[PDB]
Scaffold this active site. Structure first.
Site, PDB file in Angstrom:
ATOM      1  CB  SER A  43      86.843  48.237  54.264  1.00  9.14           C
ATOM      2  OG  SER A  43      85.399  48.648  53.813  1.00  9.14           O
TER       3      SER A  43
ATOM      4  CG  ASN B 170      69.996  55.919  62.978  1.00 12.18           C
ATOM      5  OD1 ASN B 170      69.857  56.254  64.182  1.00 12.18           O
ATOM      6  ND2 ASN B 170      71.211  56.334  62.210  1.00 12.18           N
ATOM      7  CG  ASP B 171      65.233  60.085  63.865  1.00 12.62           C
ATOM      8  OD1 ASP B 171      64.767  59.649  63.047  1.00 12.62           O
ATOM      9  OD2 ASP B 171      64.628  60.342  65.039  1.00 12.62           O
TER      10      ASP B 171
ATOM     11  CD  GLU C  96      77.358  47.455  61.106  1.00 13.51           C
ATOM     12  OE1 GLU C  96      77.838  47.499  62.169  1.00 13.51           O
ATOM     13  OE2 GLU C  96      77.765  48.457  60.338  1.00 13.51           O
ATOM     14  N   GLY C  97      76.219  43.826  58.359  1.00 10.58           N
ATOM     15  CA  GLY C  97      76.939  43.828  57.031  1.00 10.58           C
ATOM     16  C   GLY C  97      77.752  44.941  56.962  1.00 10.58           C
TER      17      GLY C  97
ATOM     18  CG  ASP D 215      81.039  50.056  61.595  1.00  9.72           C
ATOM     19  OD1 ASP D 215      81.371  50.986  61.783  1.00  9.72           O
ATOM     20  OD2 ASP D 215      80.592  49.465  60.625  1.00  9.72           O
TER      21      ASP D 215
ATOM     22  CE  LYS E 140      81.426  45.999  59.439  1.00 11.62           C
ATOM     23  NZ  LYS E 140      80.183  47.237  59.090  1.00 11.62           N
TER      24      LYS E 140
ATOM     25  CB  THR F 102      77.889  52.982  53.275  1.00 17.90           C
ATOM     26  OG1 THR F 102      78.997  52.696  54.426  1.00 17.90           O
ATOM     27  CG2 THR F 102      78.315  54.134  52.475  1.00 17.90           C
ATOM     28  CD  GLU F 103      79.234  57.746  57.556  1.00 17.31           C
ATOM     29  OE1 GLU F 103      79.925  56.774  57.171  1.00 17.31           O
ATOM     30  OE2 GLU F 103      79.485  58.483  58.439  1.00 17.31           O
TER      31      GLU F 103
ATOM     32  CE  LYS G 102      75.712  48.635  57.231  1.00 17.69           C
ATOM     33  NZ  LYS G 102      76.023  49.866  56.386  1.00 17.69           N
ATOM     34  CB  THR G 103      77.620  50.736  63.643  1.00 23.29           C
ATOM     35  OG1 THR G 103      78.423  50.058  62.456  1.00 23.29           O
ATOM     36  CG2 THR G 103      78.513  50.429  64.546  1.00 23.29           C
TER      37      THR G 103
HETATM   38  N1  LIG Z   1      71.025  58.487  65.505  1.00 23.91           N
HETATM   39  C1  LIG Z   1      72.040  59.006  65.268  1.00 23.91           C
HETATM   40  N2  LIG Z   1      72.115  60.455  65.738  1.00 23.91           N
HETATM   41  C2  LIG Z   1      73.381  60.894  65.472  1.00 23.91           C
HETATM   42  N3  LIG Z   1      74.383  60.504  64.852  1.00 23.91           N
HETATM   43  C3  LIG Z   1      74.264  59.346  64.411  1.00 23.91           C
HETATM   44  C4  LIG Z   1      73.104  58.488  64.558  1.00 23.91           C
HETATM   45  N4  LIG Z   1      73.210  57.444  63.764  1.00 23.91           N
HETATM   46  C5  LIG Z   1      74.326  57.471  63.251  1.00 23.91           C
HETATM   47  N5  LIG Z   1      74.863  58.513  63.453  1.00 23.91           N
HETATM   48  C6  LIG Z   1      76.213  58.830  63.027  1.00 23.91           C
HETATM   49  O1  LIG Z   1      76.496  58.755  61.402  1.00 23.91           O
HETATM   50  C7  LIG Z   1      77.450  58.122  60.844  1.00 23.91           C
HETATM   51  C8  LIG Z   1      76.943  56.916  60.445  1.00 23.91           C
HETATM   52  O2  LIG Z   1      76.361  56.014  61.434  1.00 23.91           O
HETATM   53  P1  LIG Z   1      76.723  54.250  61.335  1.00 23.91           P
HETATM   54  O3  LIG Z   1      76.054  53.696  62.659  1.00 23.91           O
HETATM   55  O4  LIG Z   1      78.249  53.858  61.406  1.00 23.91           O
HETATM   56  O5  LIG Z   1      76.258  54.014  59.999  1.00 23.91           O
HETATM   57  P2  LIG Z   1      76.496  52.685  58.873  1.00 23.91           P
HETATM   58  O6  LIG Z   1      77.001  51.435  60.101  1.00 23.91           O
HETATM   59  O7  LIG Z   1      75.279  52.434  57.991  1.00 23.91           O
HETATM   60  O8  LIG Z   1      77.717  52.920  58.305  1.00 23.91           O
HETATM   61  C9  LIG Z   1      78.658  57.806  62.286  1.00 23.91           C
HETATM   62  O9  LIG Z   1      79.332  58.928  62.084  1.00 23.91           O
HETATM   63  C10 LIG Z   1      77.469  57.858  63.362  1.00 23.91           C
HETATM   64  O10 LIG Z   1      78.327  58.236  64.690  1.00 23.91           O
HETATM   65  C1  LIG Z   2      83.756  52.036  54.014  1.00 25.14           C
HETATM   66  C2  LIG Z   2      82.286  51.832  54.390  1.00 25.14           C
HETATM   67  N1  LIG Z   2      82.394  52.298  55.708  1.00 25.14           N
HETATM   68  C3  LIG Z   2      82.200  50.389  54.257  1.00 25.14           C
HETATM   69  C4  LIG Z   2      81.854  49.634  52.916  1.00 25.14           C
HETATM   70  C5  LIG Z   2      81.176  50.275  51.714  1.00 25.14           C
HETATM   71  C6  LIG Z   2      80.794  49.686  50.729  1.00 25.14           C
HETATM   72  C7  LIG Z   2      80.145  50.058  49.429  1.00 25.14           C
HETATM   73  C8  LIG Z   2      79.826  49.185  48.024  1.00 25.14           C
HETATM   74  C9  LIG Z   2      79.025  49.787  47.173  1.00 25.14           C
HETATM   75  O1  LIG Z   2      79.500  50.896  46.513  1.00 25.14           O
HETATM   76  O2  LIG Z   2      77.879  49.767  47.229  1.00 25.14           O
HETATM   77  N2  LIG Z   2      82.917  49.147  55.123  1.00 25.14           N
HETATM   78  C10 LIG Z   2      82.242  49.012  56.580  1.00 25.14           C
HETATM   79  O3  LIG Z   2      83.092  48.004  56.952  1.00 25.14           O
HETATM   80  O4  LIG Z   2      80.567  48.971  56.729  1.00 25.14           O
HETATM   81  P1  LIG Z   2      79.601  50.324  56.741  1.00 25.14           P
HETATM   82  O5  LIG Z   2      80.221  51.647  57.137  1.00 25.14           O
HETATM   83  O6  LIG Z   2      78.255  50.686  55.894  1.00 25.14           O
HETATM   84  O7  LIG Z   2      78.743  49.734  58.207  1.00 25.14           O
HETATM   85 MG   LIG Z   3      78.567  50.419  60.230  1.00 28.27          MG
HETATM   86 MG   LIG Z   4      79.950  53.136  58.382  1.00 23.66          MG
END
Ligand SMILES: Nc1ncnc2c1ncn2[C@@H]1O[C@H](COP(=O)(O)OP(=O)(O)O)[C@@H](O)[C@H]1O
Ligand SMILES: C[C@H](N)[C@@H](CCCCCC(=O)O)NC(=O)OP(=O)(O)O
Ligand SMILES: [Mg+2]
Ligand SMILES: [Mg+2]
Ligand SMILES: Nc1ncnc2c1ncn2[C@@H]1O[C@H](COP(=O)(O)OP(=O)(O)O)[C@@H](O)[C@H]1O
Ligand SMILES: C[C@H](N)[C@@H](CCCCCC(=O)O)NC(=O)OP(=O)(O)O
Ligand SMILES: [Mg+2]
Ligand SMILES: [Mg+2]
Lengths: 224, 224
Positions: B41, B175-176, B115-116, B54, B37, B11-12, B15-16
């Site tokens: 959560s 993704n950087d 998106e998962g 997201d 999506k 996560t983080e 993906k988004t």
């Molecule tokens: N290429 C990017 N450059 C800088 N910030 C980014 C970039 N990719 C993601 N972020 C930031 O990092 C955090 C996680 O990105 P997100 O796309 O929401 O990841 P995930 O969907 O896997 O949770 C967010 O606050 C997003 O704005």
């Molecule tokens: C709260 C977090 N953002 C996320 C779920 C994370 C689940 C972690 C399940 C594990 O511990 O592996 N909910 C969301 O909707 O998806 P992403 O943010 O990873 O895109």
């Molecule tokens: Mg996401």
């Molecule tokens: Mg996220």
């Protein structure tokens, strides 16, 4: 003699703190212990050469008095993937050298813990990963899970790949990398259900120097 | 019509942001796009009910004007594993509802991106994970790799488990997440060698609101 490979859900999750707890528990049980960190990256200069903090922690937590090079034959200064710094410095990481070091520790210890570097698939060369060496040695694996968001997925991925390799997942350790959060108990229950190995213990959040904290009490070695 | 499931190394990791880039590239190619999506959560209260960021980003990046519930049928306020908040609120996450939502988007779109949540094995109930649903739907998977220490292991674990499930790893996106570091090019080369799917593109570090940045240019859809 007994031998275990300690891996983690990622780098920076508690492999070293958990490994020290495991070593302390084994010493309390009466074993002649030795920690082994065959490959380490992210090391400091000293008059004797480079010294890695993980390797120093494993050396200090061994019941036997071991020489630094016996605990960590391959030491690189830069904290990156071993294969990258190995290629740049022209110092190949050889499976045979890593295995010889494990045999050398088995000369004096009857309980050896081997700490990996990073996670399961950390590369050691462009054609060899840490997982390849563990598979060659057929070591039973202990998974350290840093309890945080995303750890369920990482624990399940790692457990599945270990089992696919035909290796034994001997147990897992829960490591509280941060103070208690809202869903701690639910995360522990989920991890316990999903990881196909016994929970050996849970190391609490210990802010100050956890590597030297008396943490053997948190491991139940009879489950291993 | 074309359908892809976007997962990540954790996560983080992006993906988004990567999903928005993919959607923008598909729109530029002439497709009638929709982001989905199904489970989210970590959502905020509004007069219409809970809204996840997201899901809002995927809705805004779709070429079609879609209603919020069509993009995200299951919305939970607390940012934890879906199975935990689902059980606490007594709102079961059903595979059939998730699949019906995908079919509903295919009524108007000819290119759908799903998106998962979290990583590959995020649980949806005590007996069902996101991976189970993707396997049921037989969706081709796109892996988003957040470039940072530990990403090689996570990318390899995820790719291996996807292939074991009999699914197709359609490609990966770099993704950087942070500004350029020392071993960026070596990490990219390693990831390119090890991930058994085409690198679709690399999204640069974009500090300010990357979800709304024009990032479609970084994806080469002809490789997908
Ligand atoms: N290429 C990017 N450059 C800088 N910030 C980014 C970039 N990719 C993601 N972020 C930031 O990092 C955090 C996680 O990105 P997100 O796309 O929401 O990841 P995930 O969907 O896997 O949770 C967010 O606050 C997003 O704005
Ligand atoms: C709260 C977090 N953002 C996320 C779920 C994370 C689940 C972690 C399940 C594990 O511990 O592996 N909910 C969301 O909707 O998806 P992403 O943010 O990873 O895109
Ligand atoms: Mg996401
Ligand atoms: Mg996220
Ligand atoms: N249970 C703990 N409580 C608090 N700090 C911890 C704990 N576990 C690890 N740490 C800290 O987190 C960082 C990573 O732990 P370490 O054992 O070195 O992980 P890894 O060996 O997987 O890299 C270190 O700075 C360590 O001191
Ligand atoms: C620098 C980091 N500390 C570590 C190696 C990390 C390799 C990451 C390989 C990958 O991206 O998956 N070196 C180390 O000696 O092991 P751990 O610290 O994970 O214990
Ligand atoms: Mg470390
Ligand atoms: Mg360590």
């Amino acid at each position: 003699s007994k031998r275990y490979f300690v891996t983690g859900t990622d780098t920076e999750v508690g492999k070293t703190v958990a490994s020290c707890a495991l070593l302390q528990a084994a010493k309390a049980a009466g074993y002649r212990t030795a920690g082994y960190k065959p490959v380490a990256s992210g090391s400091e200069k000293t008059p004797e050469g480079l010294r890695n903090s993980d390797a120093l922690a494993l050396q200090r937590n061994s019941s036997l008095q071991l020489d630094y090079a016996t605990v960590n034959p391959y030491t690189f200064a830069e904290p990156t993937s071993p294969h990258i710094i190995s290629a740049q410095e022209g110092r190949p990481i050889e499976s045979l050298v890593m295995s010889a070091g494990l045999r050398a520790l088995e000369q004096q210890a009857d309980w050896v813990l081997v700490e990996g570097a990073g996670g399961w698939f950390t590369p050691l060369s462009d054609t060899f990963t840490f997982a390849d060496w563990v598979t060659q040695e057929q070591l039973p694996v202990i998974l350290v899970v840093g309890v945080k968001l995303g750890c369920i997925n990482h624990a399940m991925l790692t457990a599945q790949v270990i089992q696919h390799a035909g290796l034994t997942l001997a147990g897992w350790v829960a490591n509280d990398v941060t103070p208690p959060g809202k869903r701690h108990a639910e995360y522990m229950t989920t991890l316990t259900r999903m990881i196909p190995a016994p929970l050996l213990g849970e190391i609490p959040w210990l802010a100050e120097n956890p590597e030297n904290a008396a943490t053997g009490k948190y491991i139940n070695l009879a489950l291993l």
